[PDB]
Amino acid sequence: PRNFTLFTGQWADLPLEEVCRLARDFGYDGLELACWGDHFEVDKALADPSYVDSRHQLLDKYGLKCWAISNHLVGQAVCDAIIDERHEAILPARIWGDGDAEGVRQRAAAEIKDTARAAARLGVDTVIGFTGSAIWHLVAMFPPAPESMIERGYQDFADRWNPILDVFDAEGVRFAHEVHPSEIAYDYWTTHRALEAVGHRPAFGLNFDPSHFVWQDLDPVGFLWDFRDRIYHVDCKEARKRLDGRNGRLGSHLPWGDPRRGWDFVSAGHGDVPWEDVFRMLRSIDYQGPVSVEWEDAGMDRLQGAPEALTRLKAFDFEPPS
Amino acid sequence: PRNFTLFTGQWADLPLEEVCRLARDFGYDGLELACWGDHFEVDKALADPSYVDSRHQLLDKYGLKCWAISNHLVGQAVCDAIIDERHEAILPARIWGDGDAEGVRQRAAAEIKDTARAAARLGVDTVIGFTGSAIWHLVAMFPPAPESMIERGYQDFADRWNPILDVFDAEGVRFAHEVHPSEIAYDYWTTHRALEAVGHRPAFGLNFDPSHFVWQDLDPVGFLWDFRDRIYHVDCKEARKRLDGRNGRLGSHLPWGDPRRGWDFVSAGHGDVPWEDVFRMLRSIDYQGPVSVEWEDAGMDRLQGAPEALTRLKAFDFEPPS
Amino acid sequence: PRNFTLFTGQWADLPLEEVCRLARDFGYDGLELACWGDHFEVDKALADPSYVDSRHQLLDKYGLKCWAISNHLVGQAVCDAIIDERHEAILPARIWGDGDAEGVRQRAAAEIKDTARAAARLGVDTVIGFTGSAIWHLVAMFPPAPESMIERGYQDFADRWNPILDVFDAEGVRFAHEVHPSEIAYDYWTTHRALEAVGHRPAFGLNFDPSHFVWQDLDPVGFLWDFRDRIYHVDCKEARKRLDGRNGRLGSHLPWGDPRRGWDFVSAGHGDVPWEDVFRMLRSIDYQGPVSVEWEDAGMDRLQGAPEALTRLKAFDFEPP
Amino acid sequence: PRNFTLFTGQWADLPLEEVCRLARDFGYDGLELACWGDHFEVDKALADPSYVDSRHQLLDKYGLKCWAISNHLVGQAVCDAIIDERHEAILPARIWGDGDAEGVRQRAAAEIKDTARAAARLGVDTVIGFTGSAIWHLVAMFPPAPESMIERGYQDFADRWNPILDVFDAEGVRFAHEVHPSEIAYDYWTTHRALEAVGHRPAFGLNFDPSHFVWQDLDPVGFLWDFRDRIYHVDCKEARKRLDGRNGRLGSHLPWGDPRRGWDFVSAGHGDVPWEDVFRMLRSIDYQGPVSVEWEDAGMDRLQGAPEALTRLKAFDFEPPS
């Protein structure tokens, strides 16, 4: 009886129609559409008056709903200080353009304004994404950066995103920033500071994803409570620690699935997230949106895990007392 | 009856002579000389054939020995991919030069070479320092970097450091890299990979500092065991966690002393480092160098903390059995 | 398998026939009959010669048995020092009477005596209940109470219960006291002390419910072992802690289901009770009674939770070798 | 260093002068005066114009200061719903009167107003105390009380204490409620609710005593941060858990020092209170008052424990830095 959604980003190698068939076979109520692959093309949603109708027709055909779209990939390029080949690999060529860092940040900003406009054409009220950060690479604090440098990072985020959020407001759409490493908000305390930076304006809320709370030792339940009025979307993504004295909290620059990582992504129920408290708290905060599933586990096949993760997560979804 | 030594880096605002006076009053047996302030000037050591004697005479005046010198500040600039104002603030103007990233890296490598030469002049066999890292900023792994980018980070370390280490070998001096965040080896597993990158050559060993093993959940005692042949120096630096669910393992880009940080440096005995096991393991490993103390605690005055830390650490220094 | 029963107290808003019908559909083998609502009326059981048979006939129609009845509500008012509107709300008007504290305590005692009589008529050998406590409200120990005041509390328990227990003995019925906050025995050590107050007499045994062991940090398995000869009934009631630094062990006088509580009642399998060890220990102590379920979870619907709790609990119920 | 005072409550069997001799011997800087024994007699303070200077003269003689007086015993009787022999034993006979509950509560309120007036005469700006509670005995919630009964106990607190606190305001004194079992505020959440019942008026603040935080599992550091603006006084009282599966968190109505209790009061440093974190946070919040020591340990002699407790507590009292 909550609505459950599959995040489409891990499936962007597949045509949308195949993802629709799969998600239906898996039992999902809907899709959280990634703004990449052929899933939701923001440029086409704006150029072609038919395009948004093709999206509904396709989803409707499989009995699927959509309450949100996601543009992590472009949002990352808005504030990142170091714009390089990793960005080139995740951006459309039209956003990359000549590869000039400031050029890319401006083009990414323009594209996020277009994402809100496309969301509203689609008729959804929430865009999930990332912001990037001018300051993330300073996280270790050696060599020391002055406080004015850290503050300028938050001011930079405000200066680039305030104009983006103006368009969000004009379109009647919300941004759900996913608190996550690499971002201006990645912590409980950085989320405070990032919210302060944009005057707590209602356009800028949060995509809650509990996975990165695990290795940082953040209480996801207390985060849900303290930021209750800014919980705009939920993605269930599971993480498992294996800290044996050798493996470390940072993962050692090692690929997903390498067992020498102190932590890794695993299918729901196979990890450490306290789903019991998380679900009870979404009710306590009267979170009314979809519950999305971002499926990732390097030791599993997605065809087996994605439906199993839905089953495991639903054991925590209860009818309220009547 | 192990020799205890005070690391001079947190004291570089002071003339060496004043540091010698305090270290003597505090009970230390010697100084670990920072290659900054007026403590150990690597250029003067090489240009002025009288300079090395001035160091011995000053040290001897206060009953102090020296078995090691340290150049974390220049070492950092050898491999760092992002060279900026933070490096400008820690470098002599003659190393910074024009500020060009690669130029600074080249001048920094040259200076570390001169550091080995200066060490040989002083008669000490170990240089403590940092390496920097071309890939540290990629730690979070979003946006993704291909495995090849990571591999080139370790190869970059090898290509910059092999020639510096060749000079160490020629001078009869060892490098003690301090495993620490923002370095090519910051971890148990990245230590293994960095040693491999230089073929386990004996010139490249390790400065053991347990402070950053705390937030990363690394066992300092197993590290000591597995890398026992490359433990070239020891710096006792203490760290305390305070992980209440809001504070996080990353520290939130928050200044030392801020109580919202998930962990902080504190004076020895006031944190979480397992000194009992560490000291027992140094004996098991037959570590026969000095035990140095790097004093740091933003909640305390150094003039009170430095002598107390020495007393707290000596409670773990026991006579071996006959 | 073991026989599993549903406690009827949380369903006293419903006519017994609807509870029978639900318990059958949920897969329960029987009912633990609350002595309130229309479930089990002690006075009718003794006055109307046909009443007990009406209970049998209803339960039998639904494929259900009964091994135990419960009178927590009346038992509470036997020893409580502070008799007030809370007791009024849980008592029938005949027991409340004029509302005079001593008179209530005495009428409540008479009614527990009658509960044992009613149980014997029904053919069950256990009555679950509460005792109340003259000293519960002294639990915090500021302002200090002298030790003589504490001792008088246990002696008050013995003085009021010994005559009730004489009647249980006459009727050949056991009393299964629910070790629970607000009772003379709420703890491992207060259980020892209460048992001694009554000379370890076999009439006064224990209803084991692990839920309140959770927040008090009591080992339910050791309690099972050390009190093995006096474990007379079991109610599986689950509780979950959420102790985040702000939420506290006492629950801050907050209603059930408030997330600011340090612990709360949740449905079986969703909390902290060590069911694996509890169930293995029930076999080791040769507990041969029913396994009852008292269903509570302010975050859930009883229609969904009651049958799920049954299923979750049956995963810990093993065939003997 | 900070100033440390001895709380006089556990010494009220002794004449004040004797306590001054002992506190001076133990190394304390001052006394938190209990409003009982012959330590601080509130009625004499107001009746006898020379009484208050007799207090200063006596304290001055021993080089002791006073920053606070304490009336736990009387304050308890203001809101308590059950008034009985426990109150008779802690109250002056002039307040107990005939022992009729409402008369006791009325008399106790009038005496707490007098305590504020006597504070102002003595020249101290803080009174520590208790409030008692109309609803504490409801803590277990069987047999159930309606939610309106709970709300009424908080309103009873406000109605009885608002007129007391008006006198505090008029006299220029503040009240430091000790969060503690048996009081309207005994928990983190009940403190919030109690502060809100009196509209967060600055007359009503808090005496911080970490000992009852231990068995309740309350984070005392987070408490200090969240109520930083209402920490009016600090009392260090230590507590040790021994929760072996048999002993329980409630203490089983067992006397202090009985080993079957799940927790007990012990001398500072023999228990579980995180003093390292507590003292650091006191600086972080800029608590500038005295650090008082309430000495209690049924397994020890006070003559030994009191000076030792001071010594262990001073180990956490750091000079700044400068």
Next chain:
Amino acid sequence: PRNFTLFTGQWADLPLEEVCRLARDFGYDGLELACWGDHFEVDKALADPSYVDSRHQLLDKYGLKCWAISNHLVGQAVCDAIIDERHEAILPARIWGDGDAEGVRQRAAAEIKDTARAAARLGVDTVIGFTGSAIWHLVAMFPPAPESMIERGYQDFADRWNPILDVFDAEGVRFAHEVHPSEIAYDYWTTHRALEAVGHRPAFGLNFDPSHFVWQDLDPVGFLWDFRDRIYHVDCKEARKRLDGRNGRLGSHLPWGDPRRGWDFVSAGHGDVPWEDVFRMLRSIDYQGPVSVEWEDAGMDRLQGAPEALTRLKAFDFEPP
């Protein structure tokens, strides 16, 4: 999926045909055959040229395969310093003989050489077993044993086993020693020392059973990584601690199922083995053998537990990406 196998040892009171029927009903893919009961008789396998084919026919009849046989009972007698009625109870009379310690030890060695030969005839590449130990009884270290006495025990292992393992090499069969108490290798460190004793020769590998890693506080996952090139077989046996301050890690010489043991054997999923990490690690080390189940739980019936244990374990068996 992986192939799952039932170890036949706890089932040796039953004829092999009954065991096959049950394992098929339970859902197993195969049998790990115990070299006792009528399950796999090494002497008959060798003397009777058609015995092996009766093993195959019987297994094929129930759709079962066999990748491994086990001879823990005879293996134990090879190195054991104290040979007594515990050994007489687990040996064929022909191996026990006169009961002279050295006599049994030599006869046991000869019989393990024959087990390797019987395995080769059957067509399996792995024998699971035990070694015994000349120094096990010295584990507590009071009264003190000289370090030379301890080296001698490992040398005794190498001297008795090297010749056995030459037969394994001749026959194209591996020995999977089960790291387990009372064995020369029972720990992480003792395994290192025993592999060194035989110069890490590839004939001597390991049977991985995580059960005894639990009470000894050994990381089964790190053991798998560090000994990855020598994990020759896997037996899923589950273990549960209950260390309440009275119960101790040694089990107090108390029988299986006694609630006063610090740890006990329990059915898969009921105890403490980190199956999630174990299974992921089996894939990371490219373990390609069967996953066997040794079923043991004194609190439970095997007819209920063996199929359930299979179901619980398979929830950790996931397809590769």
Next chain:
Amino acid sequence: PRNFTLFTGQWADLPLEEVCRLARDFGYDGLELACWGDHFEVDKALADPSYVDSRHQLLDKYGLKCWAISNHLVGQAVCDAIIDERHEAILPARIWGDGDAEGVRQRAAAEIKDTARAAARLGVDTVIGFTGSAIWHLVAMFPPAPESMIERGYQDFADRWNPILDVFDAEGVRFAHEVHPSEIAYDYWTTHRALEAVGHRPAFGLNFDPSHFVWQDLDPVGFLWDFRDRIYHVDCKEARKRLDGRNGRLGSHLPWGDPRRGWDFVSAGHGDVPWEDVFRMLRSIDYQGPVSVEWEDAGMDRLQGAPEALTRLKAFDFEPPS
């Protein structure tokens, strides 16, 4: 609880007089005399009527007392089923005889009887010892041993020790069996069972030593409580765990001091024994005997560790309340 003694067993390489001088310089009040070395010779104490006065004179000379003598080495050979080179190393040649197992057991019994007689001559009322065990070697339970074999081991203990204990009773002396691996009572539950075996007769009590409780995860405090009527003596010996996933609870047959052991003996205050609770409980159960120190730490020199261990342990010795 406050006379402290030094156990002399680890000092038996030295003349008694030299142990006395050291124990006195260390600050010990007395000695727990081992029945080996030249410290206390059981046969001479019975044969020579001046021998016992020589002991008193030597201890008086150094201001030392004695309340107890120990014969671990001989006691272990009464019940041990496997009598070999290990017993030969710890036994006097007159007890070892020809080494035939049953004769050794029989002679060790006769010698323990004489140890009671000699305790009485010295004027002490307690002998500390071991019993050995016919069943210790069966602890791992593979190959299986029938339950009747286990029962026989406890009957064997009763059969051999009952007659020993009758001699203790005749002399007015008690036996304090040290619960310890390799004994018939090594556990909480095997202690119950051994006590039952001898009908809870008062001659057979217990020497409490917490060190072996650590690795077995036994609560030393609950033990003291449940066996309170049989705590005849206390030896404070400390132990420390290091269980990193590779080291095991059993210690891998590795010598003391090897870092690959899962636990080891360390000097008091350097391990895991809960001294705070241990000392409080000795006082709760009214233990009035001495507190002996058995000093052992392969990582330390006994000349520094023995006085230090006493200083640490004394920090838990509190004056009772007045």
